[PDB]
Design a protein around this nucleic acid. Sequence first.
RNA 1: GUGAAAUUCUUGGACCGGCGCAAGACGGACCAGAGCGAAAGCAUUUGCCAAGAAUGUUUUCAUUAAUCAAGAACGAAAGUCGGAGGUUCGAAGACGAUCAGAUACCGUCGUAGUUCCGACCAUAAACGAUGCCGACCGGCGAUGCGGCGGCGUUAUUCCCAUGACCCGCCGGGCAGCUUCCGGGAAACCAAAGUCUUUGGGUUCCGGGGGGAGUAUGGUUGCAAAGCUGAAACUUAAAGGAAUUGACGG
Lengths: 137, 24, 83, 214, 135, 102
Amino acid sequence: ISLGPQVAEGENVFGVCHIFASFNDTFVHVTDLSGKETICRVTGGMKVKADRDESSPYAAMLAAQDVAQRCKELGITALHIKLRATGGNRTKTPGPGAQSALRALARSGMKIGRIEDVTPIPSDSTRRKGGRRGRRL
Amino acid sequence: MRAKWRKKRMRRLKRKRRKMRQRS
Amino acid sequence: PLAKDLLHPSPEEEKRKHKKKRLVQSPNSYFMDVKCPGCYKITTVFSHAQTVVLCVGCSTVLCQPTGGKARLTEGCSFRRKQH
Amino acid sequence: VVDPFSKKDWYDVKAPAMFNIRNIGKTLVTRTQGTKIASDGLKGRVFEVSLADLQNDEVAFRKFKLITEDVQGKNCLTNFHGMDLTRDKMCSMVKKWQTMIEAHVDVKTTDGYLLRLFCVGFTKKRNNQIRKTSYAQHQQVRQIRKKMMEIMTREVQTNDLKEVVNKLIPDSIGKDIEKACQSIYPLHDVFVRKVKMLKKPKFELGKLMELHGE
Amino acid sequence: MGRVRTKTVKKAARVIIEKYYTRLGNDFHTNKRVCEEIAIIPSKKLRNKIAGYVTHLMKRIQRGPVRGISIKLQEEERERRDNYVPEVSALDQEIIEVDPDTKEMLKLLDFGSLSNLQVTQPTVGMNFKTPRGPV
Amino acid sequence: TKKRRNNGRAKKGRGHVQPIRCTNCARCVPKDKAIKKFVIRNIVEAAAVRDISEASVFDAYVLPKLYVKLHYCVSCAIHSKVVRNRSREARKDRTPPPRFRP
RNA sequence: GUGAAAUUCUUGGACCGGCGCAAGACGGACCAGAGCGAAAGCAUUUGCCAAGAAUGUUUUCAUUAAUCAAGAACGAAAGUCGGAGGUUCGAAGACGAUCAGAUACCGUCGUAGUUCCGACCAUAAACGAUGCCGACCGGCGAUGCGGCGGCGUUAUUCCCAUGACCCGCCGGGCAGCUUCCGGGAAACCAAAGUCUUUGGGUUCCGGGGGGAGUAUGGUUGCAAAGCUGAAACUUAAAGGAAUUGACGG
Ligand SMILES: [Mg+2]
Ligand SMILES: [Mg+2]
Ligand SMILES: [Mg+2]
Ligand SMILES: [Mg+2]
Ligand SMILES: [Mg+2]
Ligand SMILES: [Mg+2]
Ligand SMILES: [Mg+2]
Ligand SMILES: [Mg+2]
Ligand SMILES: [Zn+2]
């Protein structure tokens, strides 16, 4: 009770932290083991007011700090990790904010379980956007 | 001029010539 | 080797050559005599048999046709027939 | 105005008897008020959990779905729902200069559970192997796949969901593929990469109780 | 840094070392005194730079040959290093490892059937090539 | 003037090769022509691997790897310095560059 | 979402997360200078139907062959017509950006199209910018198929086949490295070699650059266009391969 479980000191409570780090944003999202219920979702957009640093490591660590204090306030100790890129037909590698957010989560008084990749990997995707001649910059 | 675009220009000119010839 | 003796090729290179590419054509196949196990008579079988052979007494199969050379069933003794 | 975590309550999720460890963890849900029912909301929750966390000294690259069917008090009893190899494992098994063979069967369990079984296998280069690529011919792949289909449907169609799960904990089927396919082409990287459920036998509660107990 | 000798001082020293070898020595000051008369160096700074390089190469050639060549030094090098002079030649083995293929090669040569050489069991496996491709 | 004997692609007994897409600009490139780069990376970088290991509940946990195969059009590969222009003789070299492992 | 933004969606819960459902696409990683097919082209499993090269052949016919005007079959993509289906992407178009201007490159939306069946069109840098059949002329290590041999390892079993490797040989392929065979203007090519020491057989085809693949005639097509195809006139060069320098956002 009191915004927390009745777990003993010897046992730790396990959550699931989806880190959807794409380009131009970074989502850190803590849920239960099934993922049905969500505790807190913080993203770099609500921590930098520049519209350019949404995927910045400076904003990513701040977002991870907020979900860390919220998890500790809710009495959550151990936390699995599910790293996710944009996926689909689009880019399959995680954005810049993934490493800073993960480092912040470890150092801000949290425990780490298993790390897994939940990137959407198609067997063979649809027509990816851009044209056959690519994005001419 | 690019050779492909010159080809397209000759196509448009040919369509104009055909239309005027049919008109007469 | 500017002076390879094409007149008298040695037997090991002659066997090494392709069948049609030798100095005189010689077929690689031969004729063998096969003994039907549990029988008494001797049958003639091609080395590169294309059809299944069954000697009259040996009601079981003798050779199984395959790609190059027929498979002799177990217990069949074979011997060449005059080159 | 208030955070809804004030009214959320915490329940303990339990495990089938196939594993020596019974406590996956803890879930939370809102309380029972009017139209919403806490028990109903907790029905059908899928808990992706490791087999290593559910066992003492087994492998760590396995995950299980473990959908929940019933709740009694503070405990949420849970039955088998599916198995999946982790993305890191399967990606690190996919190598070059070899042949990957994939098969899928659909089997109705004697209990009544319809299951789809994806099994994967990879060819082997030998210890004295000098050729760079160790490939398999198409007919050999067809023979390996067809033999793979039938020695994994015969292991599940003749047993209930209890025996199926506890025998895929060490994957005796996968080792059976390895030891049987060596007469055609050697394989080492053979694992049942995924099993998923398709139908369930009408939600008999008596089967769930003996699943967690006798 | 920046004490690298130039090709002018190097080549001049190389010629005078080969031409006047027994006159020179291991002492720098003697080297600069002899170089005053054995060569015409207009500058004193170039003179003792040459003498320094001569002293350095005299230390190098007293313990081993260098790019420069001396006719007497070549004769001394061949006069020394005659041999390790072992009591017995390194190739007079009482027993000799011999493959069966080489043994029958000697038999066809007709120089086989000698007591010194012995036949060994040939290797089995026939694997001698490196695994092809990366790793 | 033919620059390369293979025309910059591995198409010898074929007539058509299925196209793929550049991972930087989404450009349709023949599959045999694009630069394929398979990368195995740490999930947690070296600056934070020790932090994660100390925070791990498990006593002995190994971080998983990223296995993504990257396809680059030659324009994007050159701009990213995945490949570099070589001399007339050095183009004939087909061995991969050393891994600098020692 | 971008270099930065903005159009645009958002307190109706947008995004994210979990559970299901539907739709139409699409067949990754395995996937390789690997395979097949006349090319175009072809990559989820299983089944059916015919077809095919090569290998093996002491089988059969006995010159039945090669190239081929006229003619015919197939022929990427885009395009057209009819009907289904319209997920994604996306000509046109609109909007927001950038810019001196921006009818664009960048972002949002999106029609025709992209998908399947049927009927057209007959064109691609349809490229190996390289006709087919045949003979000869260096070496080496691999790879795919078939066959033939051999120390051995492995699979099962009690022995062989038979699979998986190892060492070799033959023939047909895709190729690769090297070479003062030779050739070529060279780049380079074991063919683009066996060419003034010029003749193996045979189709197509070029004659300085433009005008011009245009005009006209004929023919095909629903159309877009396809095939055939000039002339007047204009010009001293247009080009090819290599070398040096200069410059490169
Ligand atoms: Mg550019
Ligand atoms: Mg083509
Ligand atoms: Mg907006
Ligand atoms: Mg078409
Ligand atoms: Mg239509
Ligand atoms: Mg769009
Ligand atoms: Mg001819
Ligand atoms: Mg002309
Ligand atoms: Zn690109």
